[PDB]
Design a protein around this ligand. Sequence first.
Ligand SMILES: NC[C@@H]1O[C@H](O[C@H]2[C@@H](O)[C@H](O[C@@H]3[C@@H](O)[C@H](N)C[C@H](N)[C@H]3O[C@H]3O[C@H](CO)[C@@H](O)[C@H](O)[C@H]3N)O[C@@H]2CO)[C@H](N)[C@@H](O)[C@@H]1O
Ligand SMILES: NC[C@@H]1O[C@H](O[C@H]2[C@@H](O)[C@H](O[C@@H]3[C@@H](O)[C@H](N)C[C@H](N)[C@H]3O[C@H]3O[C@H](CO)[C@@H](O)[C@H](O)[C@H]3N)O[C@@H]2CO)[C@H](N)[C@@H](O)[C@@H]1O
Lengths: 265, 265
Amino acid sequence: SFATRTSLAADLAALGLAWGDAIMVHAAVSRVGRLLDGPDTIIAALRDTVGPGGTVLAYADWEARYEDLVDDAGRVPPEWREHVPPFDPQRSRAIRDNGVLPEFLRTTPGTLRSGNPGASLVALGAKAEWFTADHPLDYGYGEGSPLAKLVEAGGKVLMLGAPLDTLTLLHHAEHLADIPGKRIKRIEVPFATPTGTQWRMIEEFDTGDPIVAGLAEDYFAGIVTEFLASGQGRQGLIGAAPSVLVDAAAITAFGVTWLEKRFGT
Amino acid sequence: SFATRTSLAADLAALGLAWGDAIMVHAAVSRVGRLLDGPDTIIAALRDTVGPGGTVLAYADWEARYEDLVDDAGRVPPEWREHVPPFDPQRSRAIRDNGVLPEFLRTTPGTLRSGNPGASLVALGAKAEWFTADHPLDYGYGEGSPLAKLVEAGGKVLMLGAPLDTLTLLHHAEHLADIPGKRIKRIEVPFATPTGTQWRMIEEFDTGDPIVAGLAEDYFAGIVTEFLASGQGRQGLIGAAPSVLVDAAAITAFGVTWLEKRFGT
Ligand SMILES: NC[C@@H]1O[C@H](O[C@H]2[C@@H](O)[C@H](O[C@@H]3[C@@H](O)[C@H](N)C[C@H](N)[C@H]3O[C@H]3O[C@H](CO)[C@@H](O)[C@H](O)[C@H]3N)O[C@@H]2CO)[C@H](N)[C@@H](O)[C@@H]1O
Ligand SMILES: NC[C@@H]1O[C@H](O[C@H]2[C@@H](O)[C@H](O[C@@H]3[C@@H](O)[C@H](N)C[C@H](N)[C@H]3O[C@H]3O[C@H](CO)[C@@H](O)[C@H](O)[C@H]3N)O[C@@H]2CO)[C@H](N)[C@@H](O)[C@@H]1O
């Protein structure tokens, strides 16, 4: 009745997760079933499967509800500046819009968190320092980003019962896609430094909506479904959760080509 | 529209929380209102109000769902032993049955957590080491426990919009109450040691139900209401949350006397 650390690791191996993999996980912890240790069983099983040479990653983002108050150029009105909690990669909470597992991973001892607040990833394992180092603050879903390093390292992405449109890596595909009409987001962000709070503008392609017009809000799920329909990736149960496992470089290139075929030239 | 770290600290001062206090908080974060930093705003405001000489505490307990499998003497059947995650005071999650604030406090850098799993408290501040040191593993709600040290240190308890029957300190009153028919709980618990997992039986008065028969499940709230009705404690809003602040020694002695008057001799 209880899914365990041992049984989940067996399900992960049967799905294709391998010793030494860098694995990025999107989880719906409720769908996994009754767990003896809650979400930490999932983290433990992932670490056991990849071993000390692997790395476990998740999309952390940043719990910053102050974006309801910015004006027209993305900056904070001066009566609110001293009240917005600044971003600390070691202390700021991961966003919980898509489950508690990122925050659970972030607070696991040894986990590192990258410096771009909205695009931050958490990494736990062999390559955690490299995955989270020198995150570019502008266009943090593109070159030199942790999502680009996951593709370069030959990483994988696991949708552990999570909706397929929550696959963060496809934002890296939107960034790379050579198409016109790509939407942009600008916002001012507070950073915590050893000398006090310092502000900075952030520019990036808007990941709060489809990269261009004419796309449904959940169009990432259709891209994943077509990817699986083409015979790529792997499906199977992780505990009680229907899960999907895909290669990071493959799904990224598939996402770029999916966009460059319907738009641009 | 946004309750802030500054405005919450002002509400806490108006309620009676003082510089240097050791404060134990039970919070219903939803009732506080819209917060710029989520639960961490509450933790920050409490720390600002008590200053570096104060201490912030919460009831952590332990997320251990394995108690559905124990037999008659409280022990784990041998086919489940290696699957139960052992208790690590630095890694085990705080229970989330009564809100996320204990876990948020537990994962705040510098917070310490005591050694008795089911009765564990988290403490952040000047006296954190003393509050969490040498927690007796048997009858962890009594002598030498963190709840006893809060009374001895002249601490306070803040019900920040939380239901009044979640006041953990009244379990210390149940332990001290010289009354007959007090119910007992025994359970086997796994501990993580530098040499591997070690098991141990735990005995204590059962805090999963009223200490004796004839009491409603929520009878702590009536004790708090009578305490406030007698002109003790303080009421007021913390943000949008109706809150109660009480002296730890006073509410403990009131709880003991409440029990010794209706039962025993
Ligand atoms: N979706 C409509 C847009 O939502 C924007 O706000 C959105 C963003 O703040 C945020 O979008 C995040 C994004 O920040 C983050 N960097 C990437 C992440 N995939 C997005 O996630 C969002 O979109 C996905 C897919 O629909 C959902 O699964 C997720 O729950 C949703 N929050 O979530 C909000 C809800 O979508 C703005 N209100 C405006 O541009 C517009 O209303
Ligand atoms: N309440 C009935 C009892 O619940 C027991 O299980 C209970 C315990 O495991 C646990 O009780 C915890 C206790 O562990 C912990 N050390 C102290 C804490 N105050 C209690 O909390 C419990 O009681 C309070 C008041 O009703 C509730 O506010 C709280 O949500 C509830 N979980 O919560 C469970 C639900 O009450 C057993 N099932 C059995 O003895 C009996 O069914």
